Write a protein that binds this ligand. Structure first.
Ligand SMILES: [Ca+2]
Ligand SMILES: [Ca+2]
Ligand SMILES: [Ca+2]
Ligand SMILES: [Ca+2]
Ligand SMILES: [Ca+2]
Ligand SMILES: [Ca+2]
Length: 302
């Protein structure tokens, strides 16, 4: 019913809107690296997330490096499974070319173009699909002007050749935090959004103000990844500051996906070690982070 209701999404003056031009706010979960935790991404778990949590978007995090797609492209099968599950469950789905240690998106440009050509040819006619062409550019020598914008200017046309209208999310500098630099030199494609990522235990008002600067320049922002923990991964979760960020996003109608749906023993993980991979979780199988996120999504779901 999510996609049946909103249909084709588009950007209108920086806002994500549905086919009737009404505002749409997506809230969902990101998987962790599919090469490590792909078992948690399947029809049943996505259905449980849809039905029990109220998600309306699922983010498939396909690492390029770290035993990801570059070395083992078979992980692409897991991406297809997720996309097909999303189409069957009628929710939106983000295909994330998840760069991280390969901090300049131009490292695997040729491969990214080939991957997005294939995905857009296969799924471009479905409104459910959203492309995230470079998770988190990072490093002092990777900037919007020299590396990221030119990379997007090459990948977007590849996608547009097959899919003229689905949303494309583009990463920004400093682990997708530098949305102000991007907002000052925006892409021409109308259905683009810039990624903003944060950690509730580390990022506060300064970054919120940075996000507002970007919004004030007419840029559309998708919080395609955010954690409840500290970047250090120490001290547990920080739900007080997470709630400040949730409110901030609601005021501005910002869409978001939480990191992450895994049983890994790290504060940002939504699940406890051993949690059932196909869903149907008991409250005992959810971590404090997972319990909080589930409530945020449920409490705003219809
Ligand atoms: Ca099956
Ligand atoms: Ca082609
Ligand atoms: Ca399309
Ligand atoms: Ca080029
Ligand atoms: Ca991150
Ligand atoms: Ca709203």
């Amino acid at each position: 019913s999510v996609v049946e209701e909103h249909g084709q999404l588009s950007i209108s003056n920086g806002e994500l809107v549905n086919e009737r031009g009404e505002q749409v706010q997506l809230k969902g979960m990101s998987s962790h690296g599919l090469q490590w935790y792909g078992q948690f991404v399947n029809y049943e778990s996505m259905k449980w997330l849809r039905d029990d949590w109220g998600i309306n978007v699922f983010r498939a995090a396909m690492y390029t490096s770290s035993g990801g797609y570059i070395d083992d492209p078979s992980v692409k099968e897991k991406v297809k499974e997720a996309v097909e599950a999303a189409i069957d469950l009628d929710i939106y789905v983000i295909i994330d070319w998840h760069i991280l240690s390969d901090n300049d998106p131009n490292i695997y440009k040729e491969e990214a173009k080939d991957f997005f050509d294939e995905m857009s040819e296969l799924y471009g006619d479905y409104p459910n699909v959203i492309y995230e062409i470079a998770n988190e550019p990072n490093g002092s020598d990777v900037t919007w002007g020299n590396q990221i914008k030119p990379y997007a200017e090459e990948v977007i046309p590849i996608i547009r050749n097959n899919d003229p209208n689905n949303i494309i999310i583009v990463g920004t500098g400093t682990w997708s935090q530098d949305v102000h630099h991007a907002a000052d030199n925006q892409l021409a494609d109308p259905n683009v959004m810039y990624a903003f990522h944060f950690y509730a235990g580390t990022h506060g008002q300064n970054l919120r103000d940075q996000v507002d600067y970007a919004l004030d320049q007419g840029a559309a922002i998708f919080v395609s990844e955010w954690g409840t923990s500290a970047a250090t991964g120490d001290g547990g979760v920080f739900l007080d500051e997470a709630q400040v960020w949730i409110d901030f996003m609601d005021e501005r109608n910002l869409s978001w996906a939480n990191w992450s749906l895994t049983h890994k023993d790290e504060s940002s993980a939504a699940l406890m070690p051993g949690a059932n991979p196909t869903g149907g979780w008991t409250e005992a199988e959810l971590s404090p982070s997972g319990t909080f996120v589930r409530e945020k999504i449920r409490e705003s779901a219809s």
